Design a protein around this nucleic acid. Structure first.
Ligand SMILES: [Mg+2]
Lengths: 48, 168, 100, 95, 49, 85, 49, 150, 123
DNA sequence: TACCACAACGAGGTACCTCTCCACCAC
DNA sequence: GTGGTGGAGTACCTCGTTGTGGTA
RNA sequence: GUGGUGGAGAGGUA
């Protein structure tokens, strides 16, 4: 018997869910610029 | 093999059914895995639908390659392919070998070509009975047609041998 | 049944007689013979539709229909071979019952 | 696209593991007949599944670029016919 | 984990008392094997937890 | 084509008309000998060929006669799918 | 029917049924099932179920 | 085939997204036919060779056959004919099925992990039935009541 | 794109594939590297014992185990859609059957590890 | 004799995914 | 391996018909 | 001129 290792990168379609029963399927992965950014320049990662 | 490939393509076009997947015959072949001199080890070729599609691709490629010689393509269709393809090949062979043959003569020529193509009637006597022509004339026409068809088919096969190997 | 149906005006009996007439009329018009109801012979399913499949390691998996067929054939062979020697009547009727 | 089928009924197996095809459940066929679309229903019922002599030939047609789809006769129904006949019930078609 | 028990075969002559005292005592055979649930609350069967 | 599917009772006469044999052996294919048994649940005398266009002893391996029944190989050589009908 | 001299306690008992029952219970019971391990909370709640 | 849904807001109503691999798997006989026709396929073994290696050539013919071929879509619980609808697929890079947000109400399909089953009609008859009768544009009002459902 | 760039949600997946040595009544099977009708590059991926070298990236369809039937090949290939890195191989042999060089080597480093651990504990 | 309690048959949602596990005996 | 095969452990829905032996 | 899946059990998704 043999074993294999797979690095599953998260991609659109994968189901993501928080802790309060808030499920979700990742729709797209848009680049960092398109994310809404704070006046300080800090962008968010997730747009619920 | 090019000749084997052509034969298989014609056979798959004719026996298009593809057959139902078999049954506890599989168990026998599985009890042949054990058994011993079964010597029936599945060669593991292409899939049934895959093989049928392969035959179709081969037929299309042959039609494309032999397009420049309509008579050669018709002769190949008459010799190998069946159904409407065989009908078209026989019609073209009749129009070529016996262009101005009368309707009775055209029917006799079609019957002789069918007899050459292992199709009914299978006897020269039956051909004369259904046509009314002398046995000598029928024999002479058949001898000439067989030689002409063999030569044309050899020409087409020679033309395709390099193309078939280029297709594998 | 047709003669008797109107003789009695009671509802239940006339209902039963109506059902009898319906069955008899269906049989007569259908050309069906009631004696065929109790079968003397029965058909067998074609093998492909009741296949047994073996698995890796010499395991075989057989359909239920195959087991049922084996059982009934076994019991029929039992009947014939005990019958030709005129088995005791209790034993023969018992075997008839298990075959049924 | 195509693959092995069950030996009893020549229908795709049902597992992603078995490279199977989804089952057009009885509700799906109801939804299809709610539309006037019947040619597609007959296609998916007969030639896309359960037609030994139809699948091969429509493969031929598709690779030839034709979409003609000779109808055929599902083997699952003939299986039902065979088992009903084995139930001692006479079954036949009036031709 | 294996398991064995101690048993005694006590025959009698059916004289309504201590008759034919033949007490054959010996440790029994390995009566199966208990799966010995793991320290983490589970146990393994054929390599499967 | 066809039409007007029918329902009827089985007449033992027309049952025998349907039947291609009278199975007498409850046992089926031999595991030890990879073959079905005469009068078994899968007997070729009754149901048809295991592999398409073959006879029991392989006397007629040829595909030319698709309907003949060989002498030693009594079960008629024919198409393999016939095991379903 | 076996005499006290005729037999020994170890040969008297066949332990196959006990081992067979233990095995089928531990490998086939509705309650016995592959412990999920996708997340350490999953094992804890599975054992606490 | 089937996969999970993903909202495509850049999708026109008549069109839907489609993963590349599902497209090439489903339309495989069409790819074979086109490849043999245009000439980069002479034997089918070579055609299988290119489709398995996915040369840039195969994407062109794949897009061509997809171009005007309607595709058939349905969710798991189909409670009315709007539960199964036809679309004109659009190739996308991914493994999820992009769906038009307006049509989710008809499918009653949220993007909380719903899987969406796909089918393709083969005959010209079936494709015309899809485009003229089952296209998402065709069915706007509910069959239960004239109220719009998109 | 940060999360995929930062791999905040990337995960590791381990699945196993197993092969056994059967004893066809036709003739018993063996685990050999000499396989017919195979491209040499696939053999180069494999070892002389018929097993993939540990730590080899494997695309889909690549042969993994060297198995021979009569004399066809029952060699194992990774299923399509599966592509990763082989991290471990295990081999087990029935009593009365020889231990392959792979198993010999494996037992070798295991014995070395045990010896070193106990020697350090003594130390 | 027409109600009537009582017993038996017969139905009870789609689709998909993952795992394990499969008749006994027995000269 | 190749013939050969019978019961102590189990009973824990919920209507809705449909047919039946009992009483007014 | 040839192409390879039953049933049970458990869990899960919508
Ligand atoms: Mg949802």
């Amino acid at each position: 018997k043999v074993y294999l290792a797979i690095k599953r990168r998260i991609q659109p379609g994968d189901k993501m869910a928080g802790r309060h029963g808030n499920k979700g399927v990742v729709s797209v992965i848009m680049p960092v610029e398109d994310m809404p950014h704070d006046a300080n320049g800090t962008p968010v990662d997730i747009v619920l | 093999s090019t000749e084997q490939a052509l034969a298989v393509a014609y056979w798959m076009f004719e026996q298009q059914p593809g057959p139902r997947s078999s049954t506890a015959m599989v168990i026998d072949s599985l009890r042949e895995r054990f058994d011993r001199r079964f010597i029936e080890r599945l060669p593991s070729g292409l899939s049934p639908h895959e093989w049928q599609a392969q035959a179709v691709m081969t037929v299309r490629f042959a039609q494309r390659q032999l397009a420049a010689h309509p008579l050669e393509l018709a002769v190949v269709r008459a010799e190998f392919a069946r159904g409407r393809d065989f009908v078209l090949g026989l019609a073209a062979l009749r129009d070529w070998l016996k262009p101005a043959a009368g309707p009775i003569e055209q029917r006799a020529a079609l019957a002789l070509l069918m007899r050459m193509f292992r199709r009914p009637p299978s006897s020269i006597r039956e051909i004369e009975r259904l046509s009314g022509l002398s046995k000598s004339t029928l024999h002479r026409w058949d001898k000439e047609w067989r030689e002409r068809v063999a030569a044309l088919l050899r020409q087409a096969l020679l033309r395709l041998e390099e193309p078939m190997a280029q297709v594998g | 049944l047709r003669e008797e149906i109107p003789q009695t005006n009671s509802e239940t009996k006339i209902k039963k007689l109506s059902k009898r007439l319906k069955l008899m009329e269906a049989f007569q018009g259908s050309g069906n013979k009631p004696e065929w109801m109790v079968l003397t012979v029965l058909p067998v399913l074609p093998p492909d539709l009741r296949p047994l499949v073996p698995l890796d390691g010499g395991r075989f998996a057989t359909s239920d229909l195959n087991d049922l067929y084996r059982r009934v054939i076994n019991r029929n062979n039992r009947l014939k071979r005990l019958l030709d020697l005129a088995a005791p009547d209790i034993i023969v009727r018992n075997e008839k019952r298990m075959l049924q | 696209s195509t693959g092995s089928y069950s030996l009893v009924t020549q229908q795709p197996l049902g597992g992603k593991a078995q490279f199977g095809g989804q089952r057009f459940g009885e509700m799906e066929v109801w939804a299809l007949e709610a539309y006037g679309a019947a040619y597609t229903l007959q296609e998916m019922l007969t030639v896309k599944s359960d037609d030994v002599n139809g699948r091969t030939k429509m493969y031929k047609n598709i690779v030839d670029g034709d979409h003609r789809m000779e109808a055929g006769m599902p083997e699952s129904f003939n299986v039902l016919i065979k088992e009903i006949r084995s139930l001692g019930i006479d079954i036949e078609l009036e031709t | 984990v294996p398991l064995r028990v101690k048993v005694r075969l006590i025959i009698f002559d059916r004289e309504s008392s201590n008759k034919a005292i033949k007490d054959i005592k010996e440790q029994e055979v390995y009566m199966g094997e208990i799966p010995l649930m793991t320290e983490n609350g589970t146990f393994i069967i054929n390599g499967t937890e | 084509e066809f039409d007007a599917i029918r329902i009827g009772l089985a007449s033992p006469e027309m049952i025998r008309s349907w039947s291609f044999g009278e199975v007498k052996k409850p046992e089926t294919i031999n595991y030890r000998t990879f073959k079905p048994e005469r009068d078994g649940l899968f007997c070729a005398k009754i149901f048809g060929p295991v592999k398409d266009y073959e006879c029991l002893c392989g006397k007629y391996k040829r595909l030319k006669h698709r309907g003949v029944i060989c002498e030693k190989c009594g079960v008629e050589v024919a198409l393999a799918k016939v095991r379903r009908e | 029917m076996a005499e006290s001299e005729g037999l020994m306690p170890q040969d008297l008992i066949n332990a196959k049924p006990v081992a067979a029952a233990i095995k089928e219970f531990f490998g086939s019971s509705q309650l016995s099932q592959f412990m999920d391990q996708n997340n350490p909370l999953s094992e804890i709640t599975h054992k606490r179920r | 085939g089937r996969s999970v849904i993903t909202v495509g807001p850049t999708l026109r109503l008549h069109q839907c997204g489609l993963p590349k691999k599902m497209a090439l798997e489903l339309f495989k006989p069409f790819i074979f036919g086109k490849l043999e026709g245009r000439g980069m396929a002479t034997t089918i073994k070579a055609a299988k060779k290119m489709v398995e290696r996915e040369l840039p050539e195969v994407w062109d013919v794949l897009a061509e056959v997809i171009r005007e071929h309607p595709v058939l879509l349905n969710r798991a619980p189909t409670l009315h004919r709007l539960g199964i609808q036809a679309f004109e697929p659009v190739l996308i890079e991914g493994k999820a099925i992009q769906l038009h947000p307006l049509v989710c109400a008809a499918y009653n399909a949220d993007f909380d992990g719903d899987q969406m089953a796909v089918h393709v009609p083969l005959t010209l008859e079936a494709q015309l039935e899809a485009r003229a009768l089952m296209m998402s544009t065709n069915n706007i009002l509910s069959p239960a009541n004239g109220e719009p459902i998109i | 794109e940060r999360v995929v760039q930062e791999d905040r949600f990337t995960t590791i997946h381990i699945q196993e594939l197993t092969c056994v040595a059967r004893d066809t009544k036709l003739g018993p099977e063996e685990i050999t590297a000499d396989i017919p009708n195979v491209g040499e590059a696939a053999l180069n991926k494999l070892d002389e014992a018929g097993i993939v070298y540990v730590g080899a990236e494997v695309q889909a369809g690549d042969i993994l185990v060297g198995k021979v039937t009569p004399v066809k090949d029952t060699s194992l290939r990774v299923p399509t859609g599966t592509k990763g890195t082989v991290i471990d191989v295990q081999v087990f042999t029935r009593d009365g059957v020889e231990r392959d060089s792979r198993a010999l080597s494996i037992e070798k480093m295991q014995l070395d590890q045990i010896r070193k651990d106990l020697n350090e504990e003594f130390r």
